Amino acid sequence: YTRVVWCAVGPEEQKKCQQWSQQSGQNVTCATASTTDDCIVLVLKGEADALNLDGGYIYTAGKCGLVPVLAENRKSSKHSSLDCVLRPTEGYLAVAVVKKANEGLTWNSLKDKKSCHTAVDRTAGWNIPMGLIVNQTGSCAFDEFFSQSCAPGADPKSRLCALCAGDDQGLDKCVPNSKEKYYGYTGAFRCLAEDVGDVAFVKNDTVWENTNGESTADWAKNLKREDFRLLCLDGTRKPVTEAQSCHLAVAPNHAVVSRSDRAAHVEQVLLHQQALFGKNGKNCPDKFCLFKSETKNLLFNDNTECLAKLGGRPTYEEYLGTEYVTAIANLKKCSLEACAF
Ligand SMILES: *[C@@H]1O[C@H](CO)[C@@H](O[C@@H]2O[C@H](CO)[C@@H](O[C@@H]3O[C@H](CO)[C@@H](O[C@@H]4O[C@H](CO)[C@@H](O[C@H]5O[C@H](CO)[C@@H](O[C@@H]6O[C@H](CO)[C@@H](O)[C@H](O)[C@@H]6O)[C@H](O)[C@@H]5O)[C@H](O)[C@@H]4O)[C@H](O)[C@@H]3O)[C@H](O)[C@H]2NC(C)=O)[C@H](O)[C@H]1NC(C)=O
Ligand SMILES: *[C@@H]1O[C@H](CO)[C@@H](O[C@@H]2O[C@H](CO)[C@@H](O[C@H]3O[C@H](CO[C@H]4O[C@H](CO)[C@@H](O)[C@H](O)[C@@H]4O)[C@@H](O[C@@H]4O[C@H](CO)[C@@H](O)[C@H](O)[C@@H]4O)[C@H](O)[C@@H]3O)[C@H](O)[C@H]2NC(C)=O)[C@H](O)[C@H]1NC(C)=O
Ligand SMILES: *[C@@H]1O[C@H](CO)[C@@H](O[C@@H]2O[C@H](CO)[C@@H](O)[C@H](O)[C@H]2NC(C)=O)[C@H](O)[C@H]1NC(C)=O
Ligand SMILES: OC[C@H]1O[C@@H](O[C@H]2[C@H](O)[C@@H](O)[C@@H](O)O[C@@H]2CO)[C@H](O)[C@@H](O)[C@H]1O
Ligand SMILES: [Fe+3]
Ligand SMILES: [Zn+2]
Ligand SMILES: [Zn+2]
């Protein structure tokens, strides 16, 4: 029983994984794939046990029988009394961010502008934004809405990958793993921060964590929060301090998924591992920390306080909520119950 195999997506996650595997005395081992979809396949086949996923992928995995096990949980003011592990999850805000200096750019004039997306099929980076654009546009030709973009996971020869940079050497352009410079919440923001794009589809937390010296990275050093603005759906523009009233949607937290015949086992090992390398672990700070990786969100988001039990032992639809499942369904009919593998 007692040994779990984690699936890392890309070289960087594999590096962090190997370290975790070592510090765990092999209670956790690693498997590597080039993409999130391939990691899902390895789990299906039973060659890997689990991995943490953005809601967009939880949906894909769910149609294939995988189940949400434990979810990421970040610090909250309200719901201060209960422990992190038993507290319900709040969800994150998906926002559209722009440069203040780009005066006059509103939600209603995004057509033909340049965009930065975390990656195709993800909640805040893709499903929410394109789901809304398809809807208001009446068209499915969402590949022709922005003049150019960087949407990791699309066809490299297409304009949707036009703005992506690849790795240190230009290799791997547009792959949906961290080797791509503008991949994920951080890459998408960098894409905008460096003015590669006009708008970026990330989450509220990303702006705060890479501005006002929160990120020591070279491209974020000098970034100032007041030089950014959120795009609201009412065609208005607000300070990043107002995400509560200028977001596109509230997304369900990323969560660890596994095959159901493995969940009980994955869950148990994870909570113990968490007591060891979690936020207040026996060994986190001194030897190793699961939720740390220098602004890179490798394996887990850097702002995870802990992985929380779920309660209501929800199926994937319940976890994602009727709201969002419906959003994804309506967008996917443009590309209807699957196991899309
Ligand atoms: C967008 O995304 C942003 C990034 O994730 C996010 O900002 C982050 O928010 C968190 C919290 O939401 C900030 O963390 C907090 O920072 C402070 C100082 O840096 C830390 O120190 C304290 O922590 C205490 C623990 O919660 C906290 O007490 C809380 O609980 C009490 C009692 O229940 C309650 O207090 C009330 O205060 C009154 C004061 O006079 C008092 O009279 C009244 O009776 C009552 O008791 C509050 O609920 C209170 O919050 C202290 O207040 C301090 O926070 C703490 O460790 C914590 O980490 C992050 O710093 C911030 N990140 C960054 C980089 O800015 C935004 O919130 C997101 N935006 C939206 C809208 O979602
Ligand atoms: C893009 O555009 C598409 C197409 O319009 C859009 O999909 C549409 O989204 C609507 C909203 O999600 C769907 O309507 C839903 O509303 C009814 C009511 O649901 C609820 O709210 C009440 C009141 O708050 C709650 O009490 C209740 O919990 C419901 O959740 C849904 O069904 C209701 O269910 C209750 C019981 O739970 C019944 O008593 C009622 O009779 C009623 O049936 C309904 O099933 C929908 O979920 C609308 O269906 C949907 N259109 C299509 C064709 O799918 C996308 O949301 C847009 N995407 C984006 C990204 O925005
Ligand atoms: C690997 O898993 C085993 C099982 O949890 C861990 O061994 C237990 O550790 C606790 C604390 O040391 C002991 O009280 C138990 O008696 C141990 N034996 C069991 C339950 O089989 C071990 O700590 C784990 N190793 C790491 C580094 O995570
Ligand atoms: O697929 C149904 C699940 O929805 C989850 O929550 C949604 C809810 O449906 C919607 O009405 C609103 O309340 O927002 C929630 C998302 O934050 C339920 O919590 C889950 O139990 C299912 O019923
Ligand atoms: Fe996400
Ligand atoms: Zn809202
Ligand atoms: Zn249920």
PDB file of N, CA, C and O in Angstrom, residues 64-118:
ATOM      1  N   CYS A  64     -13.284  11.091 -16.887  1.00  0.00           N
ATOM      2  CA  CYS A  64     -12.540   9.859 -17.009  1.00  0.00           C
ATOM      3  C   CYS A  64     -12.487   9.092 -15.692  1.00  0.00           C
ATOM      4  O   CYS A  64     -11.657   8.214 -15.510  1.00  0.00           O
ATOM      5  N   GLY A  65     -13.363   9.451 -14.764  1.00  0.00           N
ATOM      6  CA  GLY A  65     -13.412   8.755 -13.499  1.00  0.00           C
ATOM      7  C   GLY A  65     -12.459   9.128 -12.380  1.00  0.00           C
ATOM      8  O   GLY A  65     -12.502   8.497 -11.321  1.00  0.00           O
ATOM      9  N   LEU A  66     -11.596  10.117 -12.575  1.00  0.00           N
ATOM     10  CA  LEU A  66     -10.694  10.490 -11.487  1.00  0.00           C
ATOM     11  C   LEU A  66     -11.496  11.317 -10.498  1.00  0.00           C
ATOM     12  O   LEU A  66     -12.493  11.935 -10.871  1.00  0.00           O
ATOM     13  N   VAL A  67     -11.078  11.328  -9.236  1.00  0.00           N
ATOM     14  CA  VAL A  67     -11.817  12.079  -8.228  1.00  0.00           C
ATOM     15  C   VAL A  67     -11.026  13.072  -7.386  1.00  0.00           C
ATOM     16  O   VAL A  67      -9.875  12.828  -7.021  1.00  0.00           O
ATOM     17  N   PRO A  68     -11.641  14.222  -7.074  1.00  0.00           N
ATOM     18  CA  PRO A  68     -10.961  15.224  -6.249  1.00  0.00           C
ATOM     19  C   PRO A  68     -10.751  14.597  -4.870  1.00  0.00           C
ATOM     20  O   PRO A  68     -11.649  13.959  -4.338  1.00  0.00           O
ATOM     21  N   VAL A  69      -9.565  14.776  -4.297  1.00  0.00           N
ATOM     22  CA  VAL A  69      -9.210  14.176  -3.004  1.00  0.00           C
ATOM     23  C   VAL A  69      -9.062  15.177  -1.863  1.00  0.00           C
ATOM     24  O   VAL A  69      -9.699  15.057  -0.820  1.00  0.00           O
ATOM     25  N   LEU A  70      -8.186  16.149  -2.072  1.00  0.00           N
ATOM     26  CA  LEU A  70      -7.916  17.215  -1.111  1.00  0.00           C
ATOM     27  C   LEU A  70      -7.742  18.468  -1.955  1.00  0.00           C
ATOM     28  O   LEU A  70      -7.249  18.383  -3.084  1.00  0.00           O
ATOM     29  N   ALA A  71      -8.140  19.624  -1.434  1.00  0.00           N
ATOM     30  CA  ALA A  71      -8.011  20.864  -2.204  1.00  0.00           C
ATOM     31  C   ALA A  71      -7.064  21.879  -1.555  1.00  0.00           C
ATOM     32  O   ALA A  71      -6.870  21.866  -0.340  1.00  0.00           O
ATOM     33  N   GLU A  72      -6.463  22.743  -2.370  1.00  0.00           N
ATOM     34  CA  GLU A  72      -5.562  23.781  -1.862  1.00  0.00           C
ATOM     35  C   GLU A  72      -6.385  24.757  -1.038  1.00  0.00           C
ATOM     36  O   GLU A  72      -7.549  25.031  -1.348  1.00  0.00           O
ATOM     37  N   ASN A  73      -5.768  25.304  -0.002  1.00  0.00           N
ATOM     38  CA  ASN A  73      -6.451  26.255   0.849  1.00  0.00           C
ATOM     39  C   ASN A  73      -5.503  27.352   1.277  1.00  0.00           C
ATOM     40  O   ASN A  73      -4.480  27.099   1.907  1.00  0.00           O
ATOM     41  N   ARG A  74      -5.814  28.589   0.902  1.00  0.00           N
ATOM     42  CA  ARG A  74      -4.974  29.728   1.278  1.00  0.00           C
ATOM     43  C   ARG A  74      -5.587  30.442   2.488  1.00  0.00           C
ATOM     44  O   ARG A  74      -6.777  30.305   2.765  1.00  0.00           O
ATOM     45  N   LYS A  75      -4.763  31.216   3.189  1.00  0.00           N
ATOM     46  CA  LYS A  75      -5.178  31.968   4.382  1.00  0.00           C
ATOM     47  C   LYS A  75      -6.414  32.870   4.212  1.00  0.00           C
ATOM     48  O   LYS A  75      -6.567  33.562   3.203  1.00  0.00           O
ATOM     49  N   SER A  76      -7.299  32.850   5.205  1.00  0.00           N
ATOM     50  CA  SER A  76      -8.492  33.675   5.168  1.00  0.00           C
ATOM     51  C   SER A  76      -8.701  34.380   6.497  1.00  0.00           C
ATOM     52  O   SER A  76      -8.279  33.897   7.552  1.00  0.00           O
ATOM     53  N   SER A  77      -9.332  35.548   6.438  1.00  0.00           N
ATOM     54  CA  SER A  77      -9.625  36.325   7.643  1.00  0.00           C
ATOM     55  C   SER A  77     -10.852  35.703   8.283  1.00  0.00           C
ATOM     56  O   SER A  77     -10.822  35.303   9.445  1.00  0.00           O
ATOM     57  N   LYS A  78     -11.938  35.639   7.516  1.00  0.00           N
ATOM     58  CA  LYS A  78     -13.159  35.007   7.987  1.00  0.00           C
ATOM     59  C   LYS A  78     -12.852  33.508   7.978  1.00  0.00           C
ATOM     60  O   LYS A  78     -12.111  33.017   7.108  1.00  0.00           O
ATOM     61  N   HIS A  79     -13.434  32.785   8.929  1.00  0.00           N
ATOM     62  CA  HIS A  79     -13.172  31.360   9.060  1.00  0.00           C
ATOM     63  C   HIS A  79     -11.746  31.212   9.567  1.00  0.00           C
ATOM     64  O   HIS A  79     -10.902  30.497   9.013  1.00  0.00           O
ATOM     65  N   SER A  80     -11.532  31.936  10.659  1.00  0.00           N
ATOM     66  CA  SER A  80     -10.281  32.046  11.378  1.00  0.00           C
ATOM     67  C   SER A  80     -10.188  31.034  12.513  1.00  0.00           C
ATOM     68  O   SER A  80      -9.095  30.655  12.928  1.00  0.00           O
ATOM     69  N   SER A  81     -11.335  30.601  13.018  1.00  0.00           N
ATOM     70  CA  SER A  81     -11.382  29.662  14.135  1.00  0.00           C
ATOM     71  C   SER A  81     -11.051  28.200  13.845  1.00  0.00           C
ATOM     72  O   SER A  81     -10.387  27.540  14.657  1.00  0.00           O
ATOM     73  N   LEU A  82     -11.497  27.688  12.702  1.00  0.00           N
ATOM     74  CA  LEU A  82     -11.250  26.278  12.363  1.00  0.00           C
ATOM     75  C   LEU A  82      -9.851  26.057  11.775  1.00  0.00           C
ATOM     76  O   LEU A  82      -9.266  26.979  11.203  1.00  0.00           O
ATOM     77  N   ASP A  83      -9.337  24.831  11.912  1.00  0.00           N
ATOM     78  CA  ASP A  83      -8.017  24.549  11.384  1.00  0.00           C
ATOM     79  C   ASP A  83      -8.060  24.599   9.860  1.00  0.00           C
ATOM     80  O   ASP A  83      -9.131  24.485   9.258  1.00  0.00           O
ATOM     81  N   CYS A  84      -6.899  24.772   9.239  1.00  0.00           N
ATOM     82  CA  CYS A  84      -6.828  24.841   7.789  1.00  0.00           C
ATOM     83  C   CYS A  84      -7.376  23.566   7.152  1.00  0.00           C
ATOM     84  O   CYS A  84      -8.182  23.625   6.221  1.00  0.00           O
ATOM     85  N   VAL A  85      -6.950  22.416   7.665  1.00  0.00           N
ATOM     86  CA  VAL A  85      -7.361  21.117   7.129  1.00  0.00           C
ATOM     87  C   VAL A  85      -8.865  20.811   7.119  1.00  0.00           C
ATOM     88  O   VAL A  85      -9.313  19.976   6.336  1.00  0.00           O
ATOM     89  N   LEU A  86      -9.640  21.467   7.984  1.00  0.00           N
ATOM     90  CA  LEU A  86     -11.093  21.229   8.062  1.00  0.00           C
ATOM     91  C   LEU A  86     -11.951  22.405   7.595  1.00  0.00           C
ATOM     92  O   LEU A  86     -13.168  22.272   7.474  1.00  0.00           O
ATOM     93  N   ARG A  87     -11.319  23.546   7.350  1.00  0.00           N
ATOM     94  CA  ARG A  87     -12.000  24.761   6.909  1.00  0.00           C
ATOM     95  C   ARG A  87     -12.531  24.622   5.471  1.00  0.00           C
ATOM     96  O   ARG A  87     -11.890  23.986   4.632  1.00  0.00           O
ATOM     97  N   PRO A  88     -13.717  25.191   5.164  1.00  0.00           N
ATOM     98  CA  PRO A  88     -14.108  24.994   3.762  1.00  0.00           C
ATOM     99  C   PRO A  88     -13.209  25.862   2.874  1.00  0.00           C
ATOM    100  O   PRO A  88     -12.416  26.655   3.394  1.00  0.00           O
ATOM    101  N   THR A  89     -13.299  25.700   1.556  1.00  0.00           N
ATOM    102  CA  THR A  89     -12.462  26.481   0.650  1.00  0.00           C
ATOM    103  C   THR A  89     -13.222  27.674   0.088  1.00  0.00           C
ATOM    104  O   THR A  89     -14.414  27.576  -0.202  1.00  0.00           O
ATOM    105  N   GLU A  90     -12.525  28.796  -0.081  1.00  0.00           N
ATOM    106  CA  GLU A  90     -13.169  30.002  -0.578  1.00  0.00           C
ATOM    107  C   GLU A  90     -13.218  30.198  -2.085  1.00  0.00           C
ATOM    108  O   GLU A  90     -14.150  30.821  -2.598  1.00  0.00           O
ATOM    109  N   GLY A  91     -12.236  29.657  -2.800  1.00  0.00           N
ATOM    110  CA  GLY A  91     -12.211  29.819  -4.245  1.00  0.00           C
ATOM    111  C   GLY A  91     -11.442  31.084  -4.578  1.00  0.00           C
ATOM    112  O   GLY A  91     -11.296  31.957  -3.724  1.00  0.00           O
ATOM    113  N   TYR A  92     -10.938  31.206  -5.797  1.00  0.00           N
ATOM    114  CA  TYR A  92     -10.196  32.404  -6.135  1.00  0.00           C
ATOM    115  C   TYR A  92     -10.924  33.239  -7.167  1.00  0.00           C
ATOM    116  O   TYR A  92     -11.833  32.749  -7.839  1.00  0.00           O
ATOM    117  N   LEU A  93     -10.548  34.507  -7.276  1.00  0.00           N
ATOM    118  CA  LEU A  93     -11.189  35.402  -8.227  1.00  0.00           C
ATOM    119  C   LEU A  93     -10.398  35.406  -9.520  1.00  0.00           C
ATOM    120  O   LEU A  93      -9.173  35.529  -9.507  1.00  0.00           O
ATOM    121  N   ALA A  94     -11.101  35.269 -10.635  1.00  0.00           N
ATOM    122  CA  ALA A  94     -10.475  35.297 -11.945  1.00  0.00           C
ATOM    123  C   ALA A  94     -10.649  36.722 -12.442  1.00  0.00           C
ATOM    124  O   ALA A  94     -11.766  37.231 -12.481  1.00  0.00           O
ATOM    125  N   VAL A  95      -9.548  37.368 -12.807  1.00  0.00           N
ATOM    126  CA  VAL A  95      -9.594  38.752 -13.262  1.00  0.00           C
ATOM    127  C   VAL A  95      -8.885  38.965 -14.588  1.00  0.00           C
ATOM    128  O   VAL A  95      -8.120  38.116 -15.027  1.00  0.00           O
ATOM    129  N   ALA A  96      -9.170  40.091 -15.230  1.00  0.00           N
ATOM    130  CA  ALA A  96      -8.509  40.462 -16.467  1.00  0.00           C
ATOM    131  C   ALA A  96      -7.676  41.650 -16.024  1.00  0.00           C
ATOM    132  O   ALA A  96      -8.208  42.599 -15.456  1.00  0.00           O
ATOM    133  N   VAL A  97      -6.374  41.597 -16.267  1.00  0.00           N
ATOM    134  CA  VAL A  97      -5.507  42.683 -15.835  1.00  0.00           C
ATOM    135  C   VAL A  97      -4.883  43.432 -17.007  1.00  0.00           C
ATOM    136  O   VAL A  97      -4.550  42.830 -18.030  1.00  0.00           O
ATOM    137  N   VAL A  98      -4.733  44.745 -16.866  1.00  0.00           N
ATOM    138  CA  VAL A  98      -4.129  45.543 -17.936  1.00  0.00           C
ATOM    139  C   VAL A  98      -3.174  46.547 -17.327  1.00  0.00           C
ATOM    140  O   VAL A  98      -3.120  46.678 -16.103  1.00  0.00           O
ATOM    141  N   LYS A  99      -2.422  47.243 -18.181  1.00  0.00           N
ATOM    142  CA  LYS A  99      -1.460  48.249 -17.734  1.00  0.00           C
ATOM    143  C   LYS A  99      -2.241  49.559 -17.577  1.00  0.00           C
ATOM    144  O   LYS A  99      -3.048  49.909 -18.437  1.00  0.00           O
ATOM    145  N   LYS A 100      -2.025  50.279 -16.483  1.00  0.00           N
ATOM    146  CA  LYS A 100      -2.736  51.542 -16.287  1.00  0.00           C
ATOM    147  C   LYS A 100      -2.442  52.470 -17.461  1.00  0.00           C
ATOM    148  O   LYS A 100      -3.348  53.086 -18.022  1.00  0.00           O
ATOM    149  N   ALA A 101      -1.163  52.540 -17.826  1.00  0.00           N
ATOM    150  CA  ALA A 101      -0.675  53.385 -18.914  1.00  0.00           C
ATOM    151  C   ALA A 101      -1.362  53.150 -20.258  1.00  0.00           C
ATOM    152  O   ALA A 101      -1.205  53.944 -21.185  1.00  0.00           O
ATOM    153  N   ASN A 102      -2.111  52.054 -20.361  1.00  0.00           N
ATOM    154  CA  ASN A 102      -2.846  51.698 -21.586  1.00  0.00           C
ATOM    155  C   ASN A 102      -4.243  52.274 -21.402  1.00  0.00           C
ATOM    156  O   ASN A 102      -5.231  51.541 -21.383  1.00  0.00           O
ATOM    157  N   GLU A 103      -4.307  53.593 -21.254  1.00  0.00           N
ATOM    158  CA  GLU A 103      -5.570  54.278 -21.026  1.00  0.00           C
ATOM    159  C   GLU A 103      -6.578  53.945 -22.098  1.00  0.00           C
ATOM    160  O   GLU A 103      -6.231  53.833 -23.265  1.00  0.00           O
ATOM    161  N   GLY A 104      -7.829  53.775 -21.692  1.00  0.00           N
ATOM    162  CA  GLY A 104      -8.889  53.486 -22.644  1.00  0.00           C
ATOM    163  C   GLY A 104      -9.144  52.043 -23.062  1.00  0.00           C
ATOM    164  O   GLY A 104      -9.967  51.776 -23.940  1.00  0.00           O
ATOM    165  N   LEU A 105      -8.446  51.103 -22.438  1.00  0.00           N
ATOM    166  CA  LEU A 105      -8.639  49.697 -22.751  1.00  0.00           C
ATOM    167  C   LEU A 105      -9.663  49.136 -21.775  1.00  0.00           C
ATOM    168  O   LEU A 105      -9.410  49.038 -20.569  1.00  0.00           O
ATOM    169  N   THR A 106     -10.834  48.798 -22.301  1.00  0.00           N
ATOM    170  CA  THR A 106     -11.895  48.258 -21.469  1.00  0.00           C
ATOM    171  C   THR A 106     -12.275  46.870 -21.936  1.00  0.00           C
ATOM    172  O   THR A 106     -11.798  46.387 -22.962  1.00  0.00           O
ATOM    173  N   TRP A 107     -13.156  46.240 -21.171  1.00  0.00           N
ATOM    174  CA  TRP A 107     -13.627  44.910 -21.512  1.00  0.00           C
ATOM    175  C   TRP A 107     -14.273  44.930 -22.882  1.00  0.00           C
ATOM    176  O   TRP A 107     -14.225  43.951 -23.618  1.00  0.00           O
ATOM    177  N   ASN A 108     -14.869  46.064 -23.224  1.00  0.00           N
ATOM    178  CA  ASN A 108     -15.563  46.194 -24.484  1.00  0.00           C
ATOM    179  C   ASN A 108     -14.747  46.549 -25.715  1.00  0.00           C
ATOM    180  O   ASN A 108     -15.312  46.840 -26.769  1.00  0.00           O
ATOM    181  N   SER A 109     -13.427  46.520 -25.605  1.00  0.00           N
ATOM    182  CA  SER A 109     -12.595  46.814 -26.759  1.00  0.00           C
ATOM    183  C   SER A 109     -11.374  45.902 -26.717  1.00  0.00           C
ATOM    184  O   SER A 109     -10.251  46.301 -27.049  1.00  0.00           O
ATOM    185  N   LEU A 110     -11.604  44.665 -26.296  1.00  0.00           N
ATOM    186  CA  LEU A 110     -10.527  43.699 -26.236  1.00  0.00           C
ATOM    187  C   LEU A 110     -10.326  43.123 -27.629  1.00  0.00           C
ATOM    188  O   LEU A 110      -9.252  42.609 -27.953  1.00  0.00           O
ATOM    189  N   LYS A 111     -11.351  43.242 -28.465  1.00  0.00           N
ATOM    190  CA  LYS A 111     -11.259  42.705 -29.808  1.00  0.00           C
ATOM    191  C   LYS A 111     -10.023  43.213 -30.544  1.00  0.00           C
ATOM    192  O   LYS A 111      -9.787  44.419 -30.637  1.00  0.00           O
ATOM    193  N   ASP A 112      -9.242  42.267 -31.059  1.00  0.00           N
ATOM    194  CA  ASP A 112      -8.023  42.533 -31.803  1.00  0.00           C
ATOM    195  C   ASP A 112      -6.842  42.988 -30.980  1.00  0.00           C
ATOM    196  O   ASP A 112      -5.833  43.421 -31.546  1.00  0.00           O
ATOM    197  N   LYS A 113      -6.947  42.906 -29.658  1.00  0.00           N
ATOM    198  CA  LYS A 113      -5.818  43.280 -28.816  1.00  0.00           C
ATOM    199  C   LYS A 113      -4.937  42.042 -28.614  1.00  0.00           C
ATOM    200  O   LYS A 113      -5.183  40.999 -29.210  1.00  0.00           O
ATOM    201  N   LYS A 114      -3.897  42.153 -27.805  1.00  0.00           N
ATOM    202  CA  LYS A 114      -3.028  41.005 -27.597  1.00  0.00           C
ATOM    203  C   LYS A 114      -3.283  40.409 -26.213  1.00  0.00           C
ATOM    204  O   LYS A 114      -3.417  41.140 -25.233  1.00  0.00           O
ATOM    205  N   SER A 115      -3.351  39.083 -26.124  1.00  0.00           N
ATOM    206  CA  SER A 115      -3.638  38.463 -24.842  1.00  0.00           C
ATOM    207  C   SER A 115      -2.636  37.475 -24.294  1.00  0.00           C
ATOM    208  O   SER A 115      -1.881  36.831 -25.032  1.00  0.00           O
ATOM    209  N   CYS A 116      -2.662  37.358 -22.971  1.00  0.00           N
ATOM    210  CA  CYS A 116      -1.792  36.455 -22.239  1.00  0.00           C
ATOM    211  C   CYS A 116      -2.674  35.514 -21.432  1.00  0.00           C
ATOM    212  O   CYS A 116      -3.465  35.963 -20.597  1.00  0.00           O
ATOM    213  N   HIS A 117      -2.537  34.216 -21.676  1.00  0.00           N
ATOM    214  CA  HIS A 117      -3.328  33.212 -20.972  1.00  0.00           C
ATOM    215  C   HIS A 117      -2.437  32.231 -20.231  1.00  0.00           C
ATOM    216  O   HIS A 117      -1.357  31.871 -20.709  1.00  0.00           O
ATOM    217  N   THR A 118      -2.896  31.796 -19.064  1.00  0.00           N
ATOM    218  CA  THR A 118      -2.140  30.839 -18.271  1.00  0.00           C
ATOM    219  C   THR A 118      -1.875  29.580 -19.090  1.00  0.00           C
ATOM    220  O   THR A 118      -0.768  29.048 -19.087  1.00  0.00           O
TER     221      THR A 118
END
